[PDB]
């Protein structure tokens, strides 16, 4: 047996896959410097932002007039979005619905409405049907989450509810995130309908008429869609992570506002100007960052690394080796 | 220079960097993106 981490001769044997090494110079591996500490930097915003009244609301809007709300400059918490109901559907595209407590987003959009029971599958990327092309359309590069839950005990009534409407007739399919509130009559025929009902003149709205008696696949469902935008920005909104003091001139691993890395942070001389947040290099990688608690610029440089070679005669003659470190001045090994 | 510039390709994945892929998706799903990136980079280096 041979231990591949005892001495350079053993490493050479382990690389060559042999118990005898002949005369020559062999390239064994590379040497790096490991991190010692760990820091996390997040913005100092501590207030919360509206999530209770988005879900604990009295009346949601119809499908064709879906309610839109913008969420920014807060601290998001998603633990409270667990006990909505005994059973509910929670599907996230582009993110996993367990890791969105340590991610920083630019702007959050919340769209709320109420849908027929069996049409929940139609709120999805690139799906066709009745509401996905005439009421609510989603893009093909969506990055967000969809939540749906039962609303029989609250919405359906015995006396009769007719306050929820959808649209059935339209010229062309809707652009994503586009709303229509027109009531102009349909023109299937060749003659004008002069704003009166008749054949080929249909009013492009319809009612649900929910009653507590229909089958399990027909009761109303409440649907809310969350849209994110994970890009480069001041990062107005993100969740509950505790900050830590920053260190300099030491190889550590860092998490700057959602950007994870390892390296050495140094005071910067770049000529940033107000709107510039971070910088790049020739190879399209991050080089400079701006600390979101002091508004100062730091430069990132990976800590020392290099290549190691072993010079030995044949194992038949001796077991002595010499080590060559490539491209380094060994006053700074 | 072109070998260096190939590092910004996506190869059908959701991002051109690895840390955000590992910090946004669960282990069951990040494997496809990691495989795509690894295969693309291996092909580029082999061609070189």
């Amino acid at each position: 047996a041979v231990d591949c981490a005892l001495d350079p001769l053993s490493e050479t044997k382990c690389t060559l896959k042999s118990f005898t090494v002949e005369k020559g110079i062999y390239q064994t591996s590379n040497f790096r410097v490991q991190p010692t500490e760990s820091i996390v930097r997040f913005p100092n915003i501590t207030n919360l932002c509206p999530f209770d009244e988005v879900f604990n609301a009295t009346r949601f809007a119809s499908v064709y007039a879906w309610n839109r709300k913008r969420i920014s400059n807060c601290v998001a918490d998603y633990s409270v979005l667990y006990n909505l109901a005994p059973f509910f559907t929670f599907k996230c595209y582009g993110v996993s619905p367990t890791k969105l407590n340590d991610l920083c987003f630019t702007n959050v959009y919340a769209d709320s409405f109420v849908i027929r029971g069996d049409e929940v599958r139609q709120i999805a990327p690139g799906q066709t049907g009745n509401i996905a092309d005439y009421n609510y359309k989603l893009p093909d590069d969506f990055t967000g989450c969809v939540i749906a839950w039962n609303s029989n005990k609250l919405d359906s009534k015995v006396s009769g509810n007719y306050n929820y409407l959808y649209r059935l007739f339209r010229k062309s399919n809707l652009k994503p995130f586009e709303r229509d509130i027109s009531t102009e009559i349909y023109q299937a025929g060749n003659k004008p309908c002069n704003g009166v009902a008749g054949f080929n003149c249909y009013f492009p709205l319809r009612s649900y008429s929910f009653r507590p008696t229909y089958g399990v696949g027909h009761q109303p469902y409440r649907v809310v869609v969350l849209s994110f935008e994970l890009l480069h920005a001041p990062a107005t909104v993100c969740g509950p992570k505790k900050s830590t003091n920053l260190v300099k001139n030491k190889c550590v691993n860092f998490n700057f506002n959602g950007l994870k890395g390892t390296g050495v942070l140094t005071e910067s001389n770049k000529k940033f100007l107000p709107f510039q947040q971070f910088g790049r290099d020739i190879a399209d990688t991050t080089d400079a960052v701006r600390d979101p608690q002091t508004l100062e610029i730091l430069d990132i440089t990976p800590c020392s690394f290099g290549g190691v070679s072993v010079i030995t005669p044949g194992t038949n003659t001796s077991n002595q080796v010499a080590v060559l470190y490539q491209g380094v001045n060994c006053t700074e090994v | 220079n072109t070998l260096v510039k190939q590092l910004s390709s996506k190869f059908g994945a959701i991002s051109s960097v690895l840390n955000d892929i590992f910090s946004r998706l669960d282990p069951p799903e990040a494997e496809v993106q990691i495989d795509r990136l690894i295969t693309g980079r291996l092909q580029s280096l082999q061609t070189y």
Binding site: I282, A283, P302, Q326, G327 | N1, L3, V4
Partner: peptide
């Protein structure tokens, strides 16, 4: 020599960026 000097003069940050990706150049 004179001609050798002329020939040597005739033929002539990116290196650091390449090195930080793992590509190095060995000496003769």
């Amino acid at each position: 020599s004179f001609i050798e000097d002329l020939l040597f003069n005739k033929v002539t940050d990116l290196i650091c960026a390449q090195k930080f990706k793992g590509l190095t150049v060995l000496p003769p």
